[PDB]
Amino acid sequence: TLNGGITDMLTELANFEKNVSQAIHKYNAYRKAASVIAKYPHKIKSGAEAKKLPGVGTKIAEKIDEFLATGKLRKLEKIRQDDTSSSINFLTRVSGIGPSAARKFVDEGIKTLEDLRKNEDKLNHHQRIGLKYFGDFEKRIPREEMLQMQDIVLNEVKKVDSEYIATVCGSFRRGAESSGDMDVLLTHPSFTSESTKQPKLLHQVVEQLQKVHFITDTLSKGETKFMGVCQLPSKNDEKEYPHRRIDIRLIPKDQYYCGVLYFTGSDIFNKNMRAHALEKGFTINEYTIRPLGVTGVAGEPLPVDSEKDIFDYIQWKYREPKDRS
DNA sequence: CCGACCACGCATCAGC
DNA sequence: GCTGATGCGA
DNA sequence: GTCGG
Ligand SMILES: Nc1nc2c(ncn2[C@H]2C[C@H](O)[C@@H](COP(=O)(O)OP(=O)(O)OP(=O)(O)O)O2)c(=O)[nH]1
Ligand SMILES: [Mg+2]
Numbered sequence: 001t002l003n004g005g006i007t008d009m010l011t012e013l014a015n016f017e018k019n020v021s022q023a024i025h026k027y028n029a030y031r032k033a034a035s036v037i038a039k040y041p042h043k044i045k046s047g048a049e050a051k052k053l054p055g056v057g058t059k060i061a062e063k064i065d066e067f068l069a070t071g072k073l074r075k076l077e078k079i080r081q082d083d084t085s086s087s088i089n090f091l092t093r094v095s096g097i098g099p100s101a102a103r104k105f106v107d108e109g110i111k112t113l114e115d116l117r118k119n120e121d122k123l124n125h126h127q128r129i130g131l132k133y134f135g136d137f138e139k140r141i142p143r144e145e146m147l148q149m150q151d152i153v154l155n156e157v158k159k160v161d162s163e164y165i166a167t168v169c170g171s172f173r174r175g176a177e178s179s180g181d182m183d184v185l186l187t188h189p190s191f192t193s194e195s196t197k198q199p200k201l202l203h204q205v206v207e208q209l210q211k212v213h214f215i216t217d218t219l220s221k222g223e224t225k226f227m228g229v230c231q232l233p234s235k236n237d238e239k240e241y242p243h244r245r246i247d248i249r250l251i252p253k254d255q256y257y258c259g260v261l262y263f264t265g266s267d268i269f270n271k272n273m274r275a276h277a278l279e280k281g282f283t284i285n286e287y288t289i290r291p292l293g294v295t296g297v298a299g300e301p302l303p304v305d306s307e308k309d310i311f312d313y314i315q316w317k318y319r320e321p322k323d324r325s
Numbered sequence: 326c327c328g329a330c331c332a333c334g335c336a337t338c339a340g341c
Numbered sequence: 342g343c344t345g346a347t348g349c350g351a
Numbered sequence: 352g353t354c355g356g
């Protein structure tokens with residue numbers, strides 16, 4: 001908000017590189033810059049000043065001067081004025097449709113919300129669901145609905161086996177008053193790094209949420225990851241709640257912290273920490289934190305009793321979810 | 326100044 | 342089937 | 352796009 005104008009500009013650009021130019025690096029570069037800029041406590045007044053920041057090279061400084069000078073950016077005005085791109089970008093907003101398929105479709109003549117439904121026969125199951133709920137998914141979730149959802153999930157879980165521990169991470173755990181979707185970390189004593197003493201541990205919980213009619217659709221589903229859709233039950237004659245994206249990740253309970261850390265994010269906060277990690281000599285991931293060998297091979301996983309333990313290894317002052325972004 | 330740039334589960338496809 | 346890579350969304 | 356080997 002302080003540097004909002006800027007970070008929005010950088011954001012839109014980043015999206016154009018990921019969705020059109022299909023260049024994640026330029027995508028990240030732009031994100032990283034917007035990320036460090038959003039953290040900058042001063043109201044920027046030039047590209048010279050901005051560049052001093054890591055992640056802001058000359059190019060971005062140049063655009064910052066233009067924007068600050070004209071209240072806009074020609075490059076962004078052009079892209080916005082080009083139908084092809086605007087259709088591609090548009091298409092990627094459907095769950096299941098990334099840069100690649102979106103482009104193909106604009107090539108195959110499909111480029112409007114109308115075209116898509118008229119060619120459902122071109123979409124796979126997932127992309128199909130992303131289309132059906134397209135409108136619903138564009139919506140952010142009120143923190144109160146989140147709660148009503150967290151409540152339902154934790155109950156049904158207990159109803160399957162009280163050894164299960166379910167935790168809502170993502171932007172929720174970070175204290176957001178709204179969320180894009182719902183991220184659920186799961187754990188059970190019967191599954192650790194040493195062994196899996198039960199079959200269908202994730203399945204028992206998924207099916208339970210469906211039997212109860214909370215889970216409506218399944219984007220994809222393995223033995224540790226579930227991507228689907230759900231909806232809060234609504235009261236008679238009351239417009240129903242938008243369907244929402246929901247993920248449930250089953251982690252070995254002895255790794256609960258690395259995984260909760262990962263799943264709490266943000267994604268950007270994560271990449272940073274992981275970057276810092278490597279700089280301290282470590283390699284982090286939802287599972288463990290291992291020291292790196294000369295060859296580049298990770299050593300045995302180091303013991304962790306808390307998220308802070310992970311920050312300690314990297315020599316970072318603990319940060320409650322609330323300060324991660 | 327060229328090249329690397331977090332980490333991974335699930336779906337699918339090419340080569341075998 | 343498997344490996345390795347693409348694609349997708351984390 | 353950056354910045355570091
Ligand atoms: N390390 C790493 N973690 C990621 C990446 N993308 C997402 N994540 C983690 C942190 C997230 O906070 C969780 C899933 O996150 P989301 O995309 O739902 O982010 P988040 O809930 O923070 O935003 P939201 O309010 O739901 O729109 O996976 C990534 O590229 N790298
Ligand atoms: Mg989320």
Ligand code: NA
Nearest residue numbers: 051053054056
């Ligand atoms: Na800089």
Ligand code: NA
Nearest residue numbers: 092094095097
């Ligand atoms: Na999409």
Ligand code: NA
Nearest residue numbers: 181182183247
């Ligand atoms: Na999600």
